[PDB]
Design a protein around this motif. Structure first.
Motif, PDB file in Angstrom:
ATOM      1  N   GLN A  31     -39.996  18.136 -23.119  1.00 27.39           N
ATOM      2  CA  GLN A  31     -40.868  17.628 -24.173  1.00 27.39           C
ATOM      3  C   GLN A  31     -41.311  18.754 -25.102  1.00 27.39           C
ATOM      4  OE1 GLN A  31     -44.726  15.561 -23.911  1.00 27.39           O
ATOM      5  NE2 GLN A  31     -43.632  13.820 -23.007  1.00 27.39           N
ATOM      6  N   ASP A  32     -41.399  19.963 -24.559  1.00 26.02           N
ATOM      7  CA  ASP A  32     -41.808  21.124 -25.340  1.00 26.02           C
ATOM      8  C   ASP A  32     -40.632  21.698 -26.121  1.00 26.02           C
ATOM      9  OD1 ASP A  32     -44.416  22.632 -25.611  1.00 26.02           O
ATOM     10  OD2 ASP A  32     -44.590  21.979 -23.520  1.00 26.02           O
ATOM     11  N   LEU A  33     -39.455  21.684 -25.504  1.00 25.43           N
ATOM     12  CA  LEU A  33     -38.251  22.204 -26.141  1.00 25.43           C
ATOM     13  C   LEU A  33     -37.935  21.433 -27.419  1.00 25.43           C
ATOM     14  CD1 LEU A  33     -36.151  22.298 -22.850  1.00 25.43           C
ATOM     15  CD2 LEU A  33     -37.510  24.170 -23.800  1.00 25.43           C
ATOM     16  N   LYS A  34     -38.082  20.114 -27.361  1.00 24.57           N
ATOM     17  CA  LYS A  34     -37.818  19.263 -28.514  1.00 24.57           C
ATOM     18  C   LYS A  34     -38.990  19.287 -29.489  1.00 24.57           C
ATOM     19  CE  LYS A  34     -34.825  17.755 -26.628  1.00 24.57           C
ATOM     20  NZ  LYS A  34     -34.567  17.255 -25.249  1.00 24.57           N
ATOM     21  N   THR A  44     -31.549  29.897 -24.795  1.00 23.18           N
ATOM     22  CA  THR A  44     -32.905  29.800 -25.322  1.00 23.18           C
ATOM     23  C   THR A  44     -33.780  28.922 -24.433  1.00 23.18           C
ATOM     24  OG1 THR A  44     -31.853  29.815 -27.519  1.00 23.18           O
ATOM     25  CG2 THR A  44     -34.246  29.493 -27.435  1.00 23.18           C
ATOM     26  N   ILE A  45     -33.140  28.056 -23.653  1.00 19.41           N
ATOM     27  CA  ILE A  45     -33.861  27.163 -22.755  1.00 19.41           C
ATOM     28  C   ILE A  45     -34.014  27.781 -21.369  1.00 19.41           C
ATOM     29  CG2 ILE A  45     -33.895  24.908 -21.645  1.00 19.41           C
ATOM     30  CD1 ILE A  45     -32.179  23.881 -23.979  1.00 19.41           C
ATOM     31  N   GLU A  46     -32.996  28.522 -20.943  1.00 18.47           N
ATOM     32  CA  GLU A  46     -33.018  29.170 -19.636  1.00 18.47           C
ATOM     33  C   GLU A  46     -33.996  30.341 -19.626  1.00 18.47           C
ATOM     34  OE1 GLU A  46     -31.336  32.367 -18.173  1.00 18.47           O
ATOM     35  OE2 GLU A  46     -32.261  33.005 -20.063  1.00 18.47           O
ATOM     36  N   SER A  82     -28.673  24.215 -17.933  1.00 18.94           N
ATOM     37  CA  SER A  82     -28.528  24.755 -19.280  1.00 18.94           C
ATOM     38  C   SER A  82     -27.264  24.220 -19.946  1.00 18.94           C
ATOM     39  CB  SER A  82     -28.487  26.284 -19.237  1.00 18.94           C
ATOM     40  OG  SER A  82     -29.646  26.842 -19.831  1.00 18.94           O
ATOM     41  N   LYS A  83     -26.145  24.308 -19.234  1.00 16.87           N
ATOM     42  CA  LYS A  83     -24.869  23.831 -19.753  1.00 16.87           C
ATOM     43  C   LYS A  83     -24.993  22.406 -20.280  1.00 16.87           C
ATOM     44  CE  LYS A  83     -20.571  21.923 -17.877  1.00 16.87           C
ATOM     45  NZ  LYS A  83     -19.684  21.897 -19.072  1.00 16.87           N
ATOM     46  N   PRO A  84     -25.408  21.482 -19.399  1.00 19.10           N
ATOM     47  CA  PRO A  84     -25.579  20.070 -19.755  1.00 19.10           C
ATOM     48  C   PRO A  84     -26.760  19.848 -20.694  1.00 19.10           C
ATOM     49  CG  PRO A  84     -26.399  20.469 -17.543  1.00 19.10           C
ATOM     50  CD  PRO A  84     -25.743  21.746 -17.990  1.00 19.10           C
ATOM     51  N   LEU A  85     -27.859  20.547 -20.432  1.00 18.42           N
ATOM     52  CA  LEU A  85     -29.057  20.427 -21.254  1.00 18.42           C
ATOM     53  C   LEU A  85     -28.745  20.724 -22.717  1.00 18.42           C
ATOM     54  CD1 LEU A  85     -31.965  19.654 -20.735  1.00 18.42           C
ATOM     55  CD2 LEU A  85     -32.546  22.086 -20.631  1.00 18.42           C
ATOM     56  N   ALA A  86     -27.738  21.560 -22.945  1.00 22.42           N
ATOM     57  CA  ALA A  86     -27.337  21.923 -24.298  1.00 22.42           C
ATOM     58  C   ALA A  86     -26.314  20.937 -24.851  1.00 22.42           C
ATOM     59  CB  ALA A  86     -26.775  23.338 -24.321  1.00 22.42           C
TER      60      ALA A  86
END
Length: 171
Positions: A31-34, A44-46, A82-86
């Motif tokens: 929710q924070d990343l978006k 950047t997420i990891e 991270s892979k999928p999250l991206a």
């Protein structure tokens, strides 16, 4: 002569969320990343999640351990989140998709829990420490607190729970 008891609500009519272990913390993280706070990248997420993992507390820690984001958990790669999250997968593969291989990830009812106490991986709280500690046998007359076990048991971690040595090597 008097005790204390009180309970109500918390899961009446089946609360929203479906998953009990999922959509708990991971839902508040993405929710924070978006929220124009972090880029949808595996780097950047990891870089942010890593902090939450090492700085996690409670159910927030048991997650990173199941997703494998830290080397001190049970893996050597954070790409799992991270892979999928991206690839446009907001907490959708954390369990929703992963279920294809491991459905116990969400439910975790008959999961592989440690056969020592009553609540070791289920109710990770003052109980998980008040039950597992009693198994080792320890006392000092009028003394029993969660924060107290953080040192009373920690000093015996490798003693009453070496891991990777008692049930791995030596034999």
């Amino acid at each position: 002569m008097h005790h204390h008891h009180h309970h109500i609500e918390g899961r009446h009519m089946l609360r929203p969320g479906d998953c009990e272990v999922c959509i708990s913390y991971l839902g508040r993280f993405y929710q924070d990343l978006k929220d124009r706070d972090v880029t949808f990248s595996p780097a950047t997420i990891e870089e942010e999640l890593i902090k939450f993992c090492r700085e996690a507390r409670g159910k927030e820690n048991r997650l990173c351990y199941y997703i494998g984001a830290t080397d001190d958990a049970a893996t050597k790669i954070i790409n799992e989140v991270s892979k999928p999250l991206a690839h446009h997968i907001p907490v959708e593969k954390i369990c929703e998709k992963l279920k294809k291989k491991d459905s116990q990830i969400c439910e975790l009812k008959y999961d592989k829990q440690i056969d020592l106490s009553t609540v070791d991986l289920k109710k990770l709280r003052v109980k998980e420490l008040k039950k597992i500690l009693d198994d080792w046998g320890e006392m000092c007359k009028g003394c029993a607190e969660k924060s107290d076990y953080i040192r009373k048991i920690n000093e015996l971690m490798p003693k009453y729970a070496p891991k990777a040595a008692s049930a791995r090597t030596d034999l």
